[PDB]
Amino acid sequence: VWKEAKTTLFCASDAKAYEKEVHNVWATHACVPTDPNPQEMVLANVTENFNMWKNDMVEQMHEDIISLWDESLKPCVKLTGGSAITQACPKVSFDPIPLHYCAPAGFAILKCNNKTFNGTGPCRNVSTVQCTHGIKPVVSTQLLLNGSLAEEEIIIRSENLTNNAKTIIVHLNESVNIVCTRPNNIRQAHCNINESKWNNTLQKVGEELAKHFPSKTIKFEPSSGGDLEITTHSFNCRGEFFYCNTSDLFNGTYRNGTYNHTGRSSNGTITLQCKIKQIINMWQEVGRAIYAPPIEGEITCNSNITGLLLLRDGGNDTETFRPGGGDMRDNWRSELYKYKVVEIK
Amino acid sequence: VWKEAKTTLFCASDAKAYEKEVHNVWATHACVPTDPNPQEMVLANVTENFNMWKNDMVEQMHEDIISLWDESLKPCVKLTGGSAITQACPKVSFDPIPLHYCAPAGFAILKCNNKTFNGTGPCRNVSTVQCTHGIKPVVSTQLLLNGSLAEEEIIIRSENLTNNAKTIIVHLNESVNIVCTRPNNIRQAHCNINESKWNNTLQKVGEELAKHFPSKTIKFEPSSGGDLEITTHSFNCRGEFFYCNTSDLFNGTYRNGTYNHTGRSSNGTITLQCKIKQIINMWQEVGRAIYAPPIEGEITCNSNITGLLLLRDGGNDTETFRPGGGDMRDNWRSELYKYKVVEIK
Ligand SMILES: CC1(C)CC(NC(=O)C(=O)Nc2ccc(Cl)cc2)CC(C)(C)N1
Ligand SMILES: CC1(C)CC(NC(=O)C(=O)Nc2ccc(Cl)cc2)CC(C)(C)N1
Ligand SMILES: *[C@@H]1O[C@H](CO)[C@@H](O)[C@H](O)[C@H]1NC(C)=O
Ligand SMILES: *[C@@H]1O[C@H](CO)[C@@H](O)[C@H](O)[C@H]1NC(C)=O
Ligand SMILES: *[C@@H]1O[C@H](CO)[C@@H](O)[C@H](O)[C@H]1NC(C)=O
Ligand SMILES: *[C@@H]1O[C@H](CO)[C@@H](O)[C@H](O)[C@H]1NC(C)=O
Ligand SMILES: *[C@@H]1O[C@H](CO)[C@@H](O)[C@H](O)[C@H]1NC(C)=O
Ligand SMILES: *[C@@H]1O[C@H](CO)[C@@H](O)[C@H](O)[C@H]1NC(C)=O
Ligand SMILES: *[C@@H]1O[C@H](CO)[C@@H](O)[C@H](O)[C@H]1NC(C)=O
Ligand SMILES: *[C@@H]1O[C@H](CO)[C@@H](O)[C@H](O)[C@H]1NC(C)=O
Ligand SMILES: *[C@@H]1O[C@H](CO)[C@@H](O)[C@H](O)[C@H]1NC(C)=O
Ligand SMILES: *[C@@H]1O[C@H](CO)[C@@H](O)[C@H](O)[C@H]1NC(C)=O
Ligand SMILES: *[C@@H]1O[C@H](CO)[C@@H](O)[C@H](O)[C@H]1NC(C)=O
Ligand SMILES: *[C@@H]1O[C@H](CO)[C@@H](O)[C@H](O)[C@H]1NC(C)=O
């Protein structure tokens, strides 16, 4: 007795009420205390069809995250097409918290236990839980931060890999530490990545991509052009909006089981040139938000790159991928690809 | 105009008065609502001498937690010097709360901003606040739980490392989640700790220790012997006193930047065999307390290990370390190491 239906979920967090961070302020009020200990009702002999690409759970998370930011991150000015809104935009404590989206009474959640599931298609290994796994609702483009990893091998996910327009989600097995910091220019920041570990990565990745492509020089190039949010690694570090230049990160061709990169430092590390912008393009809505100038002191963010968002060109013997992002729904497909809300009816 | 002086402090809490958790009941009456927003008076060109081992802030916290427990955790019987004292020992709601220790009018607090300070010695990066940070008064041995982390690298702390008799406090930069549980034997419990995260941990931990030892085999072994409280990771989970076996956790030698452990399960998590005890040796005083039989139903503490309490053996090319603790002041030095009460006079 299982099927596919739409039900209004709810969130359960391990958030503190005494915490002044906006994620906790929102969580403790908008969310339920964690279980904190349910159990997986593992199932054999059963196979179900998942689709991380047409899943309501991702929209429900999307909406909550938007509302979270509405309360949390207030823009000084929110210009939505010739109409501007002003309001109190106080600097605040900001740092994502794991969220567990749970199913109402009478409903349950399916969990694919295939450690290689691409997030679309059948799955002979299933289970059941009331809540999900903790999910840091991290807004970022190009690079997926502080997410979960692929247990075994790298997994590649695309609604249609032959369509160059669909966004491709790379799930690493091994995270790459990344440390963006704004030292004591006040808007001038940077990020550090150890090439060595970035190399092993883009190799394993290229090798995985290569499996889906018969024999073409697989190249990684910077995002063609467009909005800074999408053409650079942009994210929110401590309420502040970092736009990290990535041209020295996605730069190298990996053909014939080989690996060759570009843009490095004598320490053996890749340095990204970031800026903390006030004028931003909202990921929640087609509009622009303006915030206050950076806070004082060291603004550093020690994150782990656990996933990638890419985009093939398509159109001879050379497939080139470019960093992508924009639709944050994908940032949350990368963590909800495993799940599927089922009706016990 | 600064110096080192003793003044009777006071605690400020974000505690609710409608709450029946013994922590809130004591707090709201013994403490004062949080500021809840003072400001750090950051300082440059100034260096001060801290000593987390000779700081009265800790002794005051000690006495308050003792009193807190005196009201909160009623033993059925309390035996001290052959003198037994009985009383109502009603099972109660128990869950620690962050405590901020503030300085009276006429005094301030010195806060070290150096993100690598070992708790003892000079510090060129100082600040000033009226209160402290949210310190959970968690009573535990061996492992430190629900505390703060070292922002950057792992910090090792000891009054004198060359003195084996001095306890070492390990500050982690990445906590290890620990979930202890007594399932629906009624005194029989257990704890789950993922190996991988404990492996990265002890490795990082041994590497730091190795920095303090030119060239020796660093071994981690269970406490030599003594009372359970001290020979096991004992703590309080919801009024229930758990004594968790740690022999499969502190069991592995790590030499030549290597890492080699012991005691594992098929799932990839270290399980610790716990017993819930009624008769316990008081951490507050030299005596024993007898508590009521464990409450019924699931008793779980989903907590984070943020530090360690260790003991080097003393006495060739082999430095062995064992889990220690017992004196709770250390548990509270681990968080008061940064602070130091100064007179503005
Ligand atoms: C909803 C929307 C208008 C948003 C757009 N993407 C963005 O501007 C965006 O993520 N900006 C952004 C990203 C990260 C952070 Cl931390 C702050 C801002 C992608 C398209 C244009 C497809 N639709
Ligand atoms: C003051 C004292 C008698 C206390 C002794 N340590 C303890 O009994 C102790 O931690 N007991 C204990 C610890 C944790 C919990 Cl949850 C319950 C009981 C350590 C020293 C040597 C300082 N002498
Ligand atoms: C990393 O992913 C590759 C395939 O993408 C896989 O072969 C490898 O096992 C993963 N990491 C490890 C465990 O080496
Ligand atoms: C994938 O995209 C290509 C190119 O747009 C399209 O022609 C093809 O029909 C798509 N295949 C699937 C799986 O729908
Ligand atoms: C990977 O980066 C490391 C960092 O020093 C470098 O030594 C090595 O040559 C690189 N290998 C590649 C690009 O395949
Ligand atoms: C790669 O980076 C170099 C500089 O490090 C740059 O000159 C070159 O155009 C980049 N190649 C691309 C766009 O892939
Ligand atoms: C990153 O810097 C390079 C070199 O200065 C520049 O060519 C590139 O356009 C930058 N990326 C963005 C989008 O700012
Ligand atoms: C990623 O998680 C780490 C650990 O919680 C945190 O320090 C870092 O700031 C996070 N990065 C963000 C905010 O995306
Ligand atoms: C960052 O990644 C490293 C390597 O996997 C890991 O040890 C650490 O716990 C990660 N921190 C976060 C943000 O979870
Ligand atoms: C900590 O560093 C100070 C110097 O700032 C040094 O005097 C002290 O011995 C160190 N403590 C230990 C034992 O690590
Ligand atoms: C903790 O310190 C270790 C080395 O001692 C380092 O590798 C790790 O990145 C640190 N964790 C952080 C900075 O979160
Ligand atoms: C842990 O359990 C073992 C038996 O497997 C026992 O010998 C040991 O004494 C226990 N822990 C301690 C040190 O009390
Ligand atoms: C370490 O633990 C193993 C079991 O995992 C046990 O057999 C052995 O006695 C322990 N050795 C010690 C306590 O050094
Ligand atoms: C740690 O905090 C968690 C959540 O507040 C709580 O459930 C747990 O009891 C705490 N750990 C202990 C045993 O103090």
Which domains are seen in chain A, by residue range?
Answer: 1-345 (2.170.40.20)
Q: How far is it, in rounded angstroms, from Cα B140 to Cα B328?
A: 8
Spell out the alpha helix ranges (H) of B126-190. Answer: none
- Of all atoms in ligand 5, which is nearest to the CA of residue A258? 14
Tell if the CB–CB gap between B302 and A34 is shorter than 8 Å. Answer: yes
Phi-psi region of A137 (alpha: psi -120 to 50; beta: other; left: phi over 0): beta
Q: Are strands B10-13 and B32-33 parallel, antiparallel or unpaired?
A: parallel
Which residues line the pocket of ligand 14, CB cutoff 6 A? B 95-96, 138, 145-146, 235, 237, 301-303
3-state secondary structure of B331: helix
Tell if the CB–CB gap between A37 and B98 is shorter than 8 Å. Answer: no
| Closest Cβ–Cβ partner in B36, B134, B300 for A36 | B300
Chain A: closest CA distance from residue B98 (Å) = 8
Judged by its nearest atom, the ligand closest to the C-alpha of residue A231 is 7
- Residue A121: CB within 6 Å of ligand 4? no
Mutate to test the interface with A, among B42, B113, B302, B304 (most CBs of A within 10 A): B302
3-state secondary structure of A335: helix
Nearest alpha carbon to residue B48 among B103, B110, B5: B110
- Residue B222: CB within 6 Å of ligand 12? yes
Tell if the CB–CB gap between A18 and B134 is shorter than 8 Å. Answer: yes
Tell if the CB–CB gap between B179 and A18 is shorter than 8 Å. Answer: no
Locus of tokens 């550090």? A192
Tell if the CB–CB gap between B14 and A17 is shorter than 8 Å. Answer: yes
The amino acid sitting at B23 is H
Report yes or no: A130 and A119 within 8 Å, Cβ to Cβ: no
According to DSSP, residue A328 is labeled T
Q: How far is CA B269 from CA A74, A112, B265, in A?
A: 42, 21, 6
Report yes or no: A84 and A78 within 8 Å, Cβ to Cβ: yes
Q: How far is it, in rounded angstroms, from Cα B23 to Cα B309?
A: 25
The amino acid sitting at A78 is K
Report yes or no: B148 and B198 within 8 Å, Cβ to Cβ: no
Distance (Å) from CA B201 to ligand 8 centroid: 18
Q: Per CB distance under 8 Å, which residues of B are interface residues toward A?
A: 14, 34, 36, 42, 97-98, 134, 179, 181, 298, 300, 302
Judged by its nearest atom, the ligand closest to the C-alpha of residue B225 is 12
The amino acid sitting at B179 is V
CB contacts, 8 Å: B42 with chain A = 297
Q: Are strands A188-194 and A269-276 parallel, antiparallel or unpaired?
A: antiparallel
Distance (Å) from CA A176 to ligand 11 centroid: 13
Task: Indicate the resolution in Å.
Answer: 2.7
Chain A: closest CA distance from residue B14 (Å) = 6
Q: How far is it, in rounded angstroms, from Cα B293 to Cα B173?
A: 37
Q: What are the φ and ψ backbone dihedral angles of A179, each rounded to 5 degrees?
A: -130, 95
Tell me the sheet residues that pair with A217. A318
Measured torsion, CA atoms of residues A155, A158, A164, A170, in degrees rounded to the nearest 10: -30
Report yes or no: B35 and B131 within 8 Å, Cβ to Cβ: yes
Locus of tokens 């467009």? A226
Q: How far is it, in rounded angstroms, from Cα B236 to Cα A246?
A: 49
* Residue B252: partners with Cβ closer than 8 Å, 6 or more residues away: B202, B219, B220, B259, B260, B261, B262
Q: How far is CA A190 from CA A116, A184, A221, A275, A302, in A?
A: 34, 12, 20, 8, 12
- Helix B56-72 vs helix B328-336: crossing angle, to nearest 10: 130
Spell out the alpha helix ranges (H) of B111-214. Answer: 195-211
| Structure tokens that stand for B307 in this block | 């530090």
| Structure tokens that stand for B130 in this block | 């009226």
According to DSSP, residue A28 is labeled H
| Structure tokens that stand for B139 in this block | 């009573």
| Closest Cβ–Cβ partner in B14, B42, B302 for A36 | B302
CB contacts, 8 Å: A36 with chain B = 300, 302
Nearest alpha carbon to residue B139 among B329, B343, B345, B344: B329
| Structure tokens that stand for B137 in this block | 């008064």
Query: After which residues does a break in chain A occur, C–N more than 2.5 Å?
Result: 184, 315
- Residue A327: CB within 6 Å of ligand 1? yes
Report yes or no: A23 and A72 within 8 Å, Cβ to Cβ: yes
Q: How far is it, in rounded angstroms, from Cα B234 to Cα B236?
A: 7
